[PDB]
Amino acid sequence: GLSQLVAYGAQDVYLTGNPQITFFKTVYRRYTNFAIESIQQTINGSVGFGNKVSTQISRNGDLITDIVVEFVLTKGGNGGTTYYPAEELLQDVELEIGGQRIDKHYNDWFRTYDALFRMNDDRYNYRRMTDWVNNELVGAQKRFYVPLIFFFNQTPGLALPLIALQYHEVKLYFTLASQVQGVNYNGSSAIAGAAQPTMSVWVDYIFLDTQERTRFAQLPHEYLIEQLQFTGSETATPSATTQASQNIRLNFNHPTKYLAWNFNNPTNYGQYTALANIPGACSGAGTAAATVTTPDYGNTGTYNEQLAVLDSAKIQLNGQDRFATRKGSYFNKVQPYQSIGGVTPAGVYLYSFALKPAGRQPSGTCNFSRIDNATLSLTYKTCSIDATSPAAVLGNTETVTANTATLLTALNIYAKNYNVLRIMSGMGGLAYAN
Amino acid sequence: GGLSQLVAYGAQDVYLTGNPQITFFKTVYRRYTNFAIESIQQTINGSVGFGNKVSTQISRNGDLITDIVVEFVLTKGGNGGTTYYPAEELLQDVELEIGGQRIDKHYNDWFRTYDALFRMNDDRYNYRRMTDWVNNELVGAQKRFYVPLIFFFNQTPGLALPLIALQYHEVKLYFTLASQVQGVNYNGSSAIAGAAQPTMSVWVDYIFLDTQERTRFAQLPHEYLIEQLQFTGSETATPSATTQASQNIRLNFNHPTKYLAWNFNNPTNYGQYTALANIPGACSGAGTAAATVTTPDYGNTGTYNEQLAVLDSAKIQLNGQDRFATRKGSYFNKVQPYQSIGGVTPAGVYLYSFALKPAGRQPSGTCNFSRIDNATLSLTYKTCSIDATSPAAVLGNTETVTANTATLLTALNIYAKNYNVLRIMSGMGGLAYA
Amino acid sequence: ATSPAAVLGNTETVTANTATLLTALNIYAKNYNVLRIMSGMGGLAY
């Protein structure tokens, strides 16, 4: 207390001065001259369920951004039988530049991503573009639009300069699911007469005027981009008599923005929670016909955490706790509150290393290329609740879930990290491998 | 803990945190010109009533103006479900005149189309609360409605209109009140005996500048990059039971256009952009014995069910050349706004942007129709073969067909939003381009 | 308040007879101040 302090009797009178800026008169920035065109790509290979197809993006414009994969499907059953089927159909999509994999997304990632990062009417509109949401009936035909979510598919700021890649081609490889719920299969039962999908891939191209087009064509460029890292693993399945726990190695690299994960029943796409005889939680739920072994497919997702299987979790780095152990509901509700601002469905979890993981601008990362032992430690809920008795579910406790929750045996762990896509002398690839 | 993440530092961190440019742990602020905002009522010249044309003149009480809200007091001429955004329907149009020059003009249908495309989530709901009855109000109920105007200066402080610099020019607004408003003074074609006439008032939010800003406005010349709406109505090449009608509509537009927007509608029923059907919400009494497919469930006039939309596909031609590949109506209805706005657009409403982000004020790519001698919108309609009175016929239909009642959507409304320059000098203002 | 016809079919200047139960009024104001930290100690400017 022998330090110097200031009385500040009129510190603020002293610190004032003239205005710097006025709110009521905007200056708009003059931008470059460009145009946007939607161009169809040629897809090689037969499109159909279970098939692998691909497309090369044609050099029609200078830069590319948005990519939408169109699919045409017909319902194989009535309303309540499908769940985001166009999302399910695109089993995966791989982005290759110069022959090097830059990224790769999975149907489950699209479901996880959406569940975690989209929101409000955007999420609804998304659902409109991937599912039947107006109680459509068997045979109903719709064109679905599945937007891709690669770094260049989200912002013009990361438009991929095909013009700057004169020696390297850019391709998308797409795996179509062998089965799509409510379209060609009802659970495990094939739907006789189901149609094969029609597919079309659209790329929205940016046409640049001469000065900017030339700079892209001739100069080296470094684009800060986001990559998905992913692998599936067995879940330490919980049971009626026990709280299972599991030490999961996190085989990730690069400065990671966040980790995200879900547990699921691989039988039913998007099922991240247990089934129960409560409205929407199972096929026929709330009635005598309810079966807690089959979801109400049209209502597969839920916010009822009582049906989720994670009791608590922590992430360790180099074997040491990165943060204090928190409950599954923390990862499901709070992380998203703080970091995204949307609402995340039960069974979907997030842990961010970033202030704002939902944005493009770096805001703190965890560099797993500098971490020797990254481990996710999970504790599961006890599967003791009789799912066929609503009272058992709705009146339960924090540490328990449905007996049907033991069917959520698959675990998917995803991570998003920042790498650099470098382009020069007509060629390109990633700045870092690992 | 957190330290274990900081220590994991290496080569891949350089592009994120090497030579830091900003810190996220410190907010930087800007000294803004002092100002105040006061709400002042303007008067209305002319008799307020249905079918009447009335107008105001904005006095120079403050220096700059932004938001304008028109208040209406309406009664319900029937029970809940009989009205649809009635204050929006009532304000048939508003014309903006400066110095006698027509600067812009909005239409009730535009307000509906604008909302359908650009408002969202709770902004949209709160908006609905200010223009309709959304709490199941009954006949005789009376409410004050607030219909904000959407002229360029009514959307952002940045374009506050400089009444201050307009020494010799008055700013006037002409408001046309619809001769009929559904569920207020008419029920379909029938008048409602005893219906009350509206009470109306126009409110303007004025900005009061300090001495220094005030001086600059008075002495400096100004120019503003502003928006205008271009609009014409056309007959729809009405489709039928046995055919897919098609139509080439000349786009009689000029100026740098941010985007086009359009819808098809039934002139009888405000906001009806889709076909009627015996499925819940799609017609008066839909889903039951009393259902009719000649009249909408007015309270549920809008829908996200495309099966009831009329348009099959569309393209825009510039001087006879395709501007982009033909895309399905569902592409304009769902994808365009996904990409460009981030909200959800109801069936029957379509958008095509020339801009990266048409929802913003900052120009981001435009189609200058002042340099396109002959632009055309080419539309293909669906076959009107589905029997609207048979829920299954509608819900189980195909991509290329719609309801037989879709032939009631005989009007086509095409809008274009563009950028012009409002110049102010010598106490007078007006547009730079015809 | 117990009759929907009266509740849902009425005008602007009226409310429920049960609205007289709303006897509390809460008024909030959010404002700007400065928090200062110097030489290991801190508190508000004013």
Next chain:
Amino acid sequence: AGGLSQLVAYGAQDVYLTGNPQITFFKTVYRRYTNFAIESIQQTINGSVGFGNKVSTQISRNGDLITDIVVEFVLTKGGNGGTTYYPAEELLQDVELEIGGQRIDKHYNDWFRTYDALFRMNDDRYNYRRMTDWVNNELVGAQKRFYVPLIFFFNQTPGLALPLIALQYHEVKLYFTLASQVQGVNYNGSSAIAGAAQPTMSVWVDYIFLDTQERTRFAQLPHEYLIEQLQFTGSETATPSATTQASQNIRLNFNHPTKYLAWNFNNPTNYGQYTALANIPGACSGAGTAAATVTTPDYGNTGTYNEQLAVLDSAKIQLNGQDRFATRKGSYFNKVQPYQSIGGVTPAGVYLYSFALKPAGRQPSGTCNFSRIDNATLSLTYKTCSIDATSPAAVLGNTETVTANTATLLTALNIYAKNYNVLRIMSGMGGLAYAN
């Protein structure tokens, strides 16, 4: 913000309080003092102790300085609770202080009562009563040791400790006279109480033992102490008539710089009675009921604050033929004077007039030198004794100028003067300086 918001609120008006600060409040510096110790030592009392007897003691030289003196008495109640009033105070009829054969001072039981009435207060007064009376509703035969502190100048402060050490050749004595009767102990009004016990007495003196340099200084240096003395004479009261207002001019045979005069009117029959008796709960034996009498007080409740029972209407002090101050009402002497100058509650019938700014203190603060006043007198006007003491309506509903018919029993007047003199000690001997 917070406490700091007060510190920063500084302007011109503050310069007068905190500009160029001289002192603080957050750091006390104490003064270093000498090495000394204090001890309570019993004195030997010569003569026979008993009611009405005169006994005495020479203060032994069991220390260098003396201060506090407490006289212990053991008495037994001759009746039940309510029959006594400060009986150990009544018992010690008088105390005389003599040094080297010269009287320094002399106090009387009535002075102790008067002094207390004016100068002790609050719990000090209560604790005092606890040391001289039975205040817990004790019954007949109850035995208590009473402690009567003396109030001579050296019994008030160490600052005036009597330098017994500096008096190597002159004795210091205390003479004590015990009352012939003590109310509620050996007599009940005029009636002797058969079987009453005689008092047991012990005199304690607190002696200060000084360490060597300080002791030597007192032993060898001459000293002059500015000390107080009590002057006292009894006078007959111009007892008011029940028909009119008596008046009286009393010569005040006082000398020396006087701090204050004090006086009271009383009924010698009943120790401590300075007011009239009346049939109201606080003013007579059995008051408030059928058995009430207004000839005898409820002794345990002898005193009162109700001036309606007092006899002084008004008074002035005249010096050498000239009024010192305008005549003021008796209630002015009873309530205001001590309010202003002492700060306690003076009981009805007891009056004070100060010539001093702070008479309750020891630092001289203005005195009236009666040795320079050829003829000082106290001029009194009495209240009319017309109120029927046996009728509460008359006792309590009366006027400023009247009192009880029983107020005519207050026939004695005690006038005191407390003054300064100087006790000069040298060559082992010491007597108070001024003769008159």
Next chain:
Amino acid sequence: GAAQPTMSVWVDYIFLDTQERTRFAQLPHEYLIEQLQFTGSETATPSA
């Protein structure tokens, strides 16, 4: 049954233009004012 009064106090305010508001706010002022002194008392009772 007499009713209690309803009371309201209205003050007529003067709004000055700019130069005067400034001078009044900053300059010292001095006014002669009027005051009412009042002493109530008994009247010698008038007599018949």
Next chain:
Amino acid sequence: VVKPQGYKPEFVNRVNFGKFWACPEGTTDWGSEDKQCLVSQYGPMMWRNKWGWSCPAGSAPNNSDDWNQKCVQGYSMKKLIDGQWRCTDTEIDTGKDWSNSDWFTAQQQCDRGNNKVFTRRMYIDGKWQCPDGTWDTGFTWSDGENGGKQCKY
């Protein structure tokens, strides 16, 4: 070991008020060139004078060590104006005339609250002029956002 620090006074820069420079309003017109304005409540008995440290022109001594904080910001002196030793109309005469005070409080007389750089003109010479002890800044009551009148310290 790291060397301890003393008062370390905080001084701002003088500002352009239009055709003249003067110290900002929460501050005082202290010294010159290197130390033009005091911000903190105490400052470095600037040596430049006439030469002399009092303290100087606008601050007064306090009873302390560490020269950096020996003068207190916001004072002046009796400053004879016309025929009377009055403080400026916007200043507050503390009452510490000189004769009834010690050296430190005797100097701290006028308490220049809210008027550390500019004051108002005085009706002293019958003409409403700049106070005898200050510089005549060109501003007037009609001039807006400049309430100061001919004054500078």
